């Protein structure tokens, strides 16, 4: 494993703890959510992100954050605001942006000196 992979696995593990039922663990299928693919053109889930870390597909934390935000935005676009999925996506989004804030990344960058 590489330092970036170890860092991204840490961030991913903390985010996945916020989803105990595994609603974001794997892709949303049309069988699980009628007409999902008709609406969501760029799907994302934690499993796809985990596979990207394992394959060394992330060149930056910014790219990892963008995939995470896409996952949450898709749930908030597809599901209405009073649903379990919309609420959980909003919760996960705020938790990830707190964990990977510019302040926290700058402190990590300074510690690499
Ligand atoms: C990855 O699997 C699942 C996804 C969803 C699921 C997720 N997201 C993000 C959605 O937007 C969504 C929207 N509508 C309907 C369903 C979902 C639900 C599941 O069942 C209740 C499973 C099934 N597993 C927990 C075993």
UniProtKB/Swiss-Prot annotation:
Subcellular locations according to the entry: Nucleus
Residue span(s) of domain Bromo: 1-101
Domain of life: Eukaryota
Annotated site location: Histone H4K5ac H4K8ac and histone H4K5bu H4K8bu binding: 32, 85
Histone H4K5ac H4K8ac and histone H4K5bu H4K8bu binding: annotated span: 77-79
Swiss-Prot/TrEMBL domain comment: The Bromo domain mediates interaction with histones that have acetylated lysine residues at specific positions. Also recognizes and binds histones that are butyrylated.
Oligomer status and interactors: Binds acetylated histones H3 and H4. Binds butyrylated histone H4. Component of the multiprotein chromatin-remodeling subcomplex SWI/SNF called GBAF, which includes at least BICRA or BICRAL (mutually exclusive), BRD9, SS18, the core BAF subunits, SMARCA2/BRM, SMARCA4/BRG1/BAF190A, ACTL6A/BAF53, SMARCC1/BAF155, and SMARCD1/BAF60A. Interacts (via N-terminal bromodomain) with acetylated RAD54. Interacts (via C-terminus) with RAD51.
Function: Plays a role in chromatin remodeling and regulation of transcription. Acts as a chromatin reader that recognizes and binds acylated histones: binds histones that are acetylated and/or butyrylated. Component of SWI/SNF chromatin remodeling subcomplex GBAF that carries out key enzymatic activities, changing chromatin structure by altering DNA-histone contacts within a nucleosome in an ATP-dependent manner. Also orchestrates the RAD51-RAD54 complex formation and thereby plays a role in homologous recombination (HR).
Record-given protein name: Bromodomain-containing protein 9
Organism: Homo sapiens (Human)
Taxonomic lineage of the native organism: Eukaryota, Metazoa, Chordata, Craniata, Vertebrata
Parent-protein start and end of this portion: 138 to 238 of 597
